[model samples]
Target: DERKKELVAQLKEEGFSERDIAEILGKISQGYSLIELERLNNAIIIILRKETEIIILVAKGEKKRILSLRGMSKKEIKKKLREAGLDEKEIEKVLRLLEKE
Candidate 1:
């Protein structure tokens, strides 16, 4: 989880406090299949396990979305990922692979 810790540290340096991190996590957990350790090409998707919610943050050049599981299918997620302008082929490949799971 080095990436995760590093991300938190970076966020802290960027002025995001632990409480803010906790709140973000509390907003978006269920939507996450895994807690992405590194910053997504967009932004980290925070997971709120207890609340079964999520907060998806995006960096510049990223697309925005309301990614709750209810209204979306796997394909939709994939589409949104692309729309977010992620160019990490490895990430795309992994996501495509996850479609089967």
Candidate 2:
């Protein structure tokens, strides 16, 4: 119980939802080691931070290109990212963040 509370705090700090934490805790109760959970959380946080940074840079580059193109449409902007060699998932994530902003 003490370990679960500690884990809840750590997972929340890393931006996991209550539902996600609940599921992970259930797995832990089902015999997953705390060490395994900590390792997984660390990897997840790294990926999340990297993905956010990647999307932000992509957004900035798109803004600069749009300014140069003097009003490129969303379709054109999307095409530009695709042309720049971003994979589908990366392009999708970038677009999703841009949409949120």
Candidate 3:
């Protein structure tokens, strides 16, 4: 709960919305509710869009992390995920979910 609150605060400092946070966390199988997000502190996010889904990358000042979706071909999406150090298995899983959902 505290962590969620911290993230919310951070997002506010950067002008990000709940929709943006949800997009990022969802790609990683994390269900971050809007209420929870409202509790975070000093987090900023960069939002992107794909053919089938929305992507969001989050950062807390210097302590930043990326969360995004694979709504495109393996080549286009995997490169970004890999750069962020996301596991290949998770990447593949997201791709499957995108294909199915």
Candidate 4:
């Protein structure tokens, strides 16, 4: 009878597991913001994209840390992700999606 339930139903159409949807919603509740920088700042910060560097915002409660990668290509991002524990196939799929944005 509300947004949460409707959202859950919609996510299934895109193949999301229920737990993944629920937990992500728990963090992103109330529609505070989506991809806008200041909200990221309040939750954190973002100046948007387009620059020599790419951002990796490590959000861990109030201890969120930002890493800016200068002159980094997608290859470097792949390496970073690899170090962070993503398997090659997962990294390939993840980077494939990022390329579109």
lDDT of 3 at 8: 58
Off by over 4 Å in 2: 36-101
Q: Taking the tens digit of each residue's C-alpha lDDT, what string does model 3 give over 1-101?
A: 67556665666675666875565445434443332122123443344344435554545555556555544557777676555544576556545544444
Which lDDT tens digits does candidate 4 get at residues 31-63? 421222222222322212333334544333345
**lDDT against true structure, model 2:** 0.44
In the order shown, what is each candidate's alpha-carbon RMSD? 6.4, 15.0, 10.2, 10.3
Task: Estimate the TM-score of every prediction.
Answer: 0.40, 0.35, 0.35, 0.38
Return the top candidate by lDDT. Answer: 3
Candidate 2 per-residue lDDT over residues 1-101, each given as its tens digit: 88768877887886667776775566456544233222221122111122122211122222312111225555765676665545566556655544543
Better of 1 and 3 by lDDT: 3
Q: What order do you get sorting by lDDT, best first?
A: 3, 4, 1, 2
Query: In model 4, which runs have C-alpha deviations exceeding 4 angstroms?
Result: 1-6, 13-18, 30-73
- Model 3 TM-score on a 0 to 1 scale: 0.35
Best by the TM-score measure? 1
Superposition error at 43 for model 3 (Å): 17
- Against the reference, the lDDT scores of all candidates come to 0.45, 0.44, 0.50, 0.46
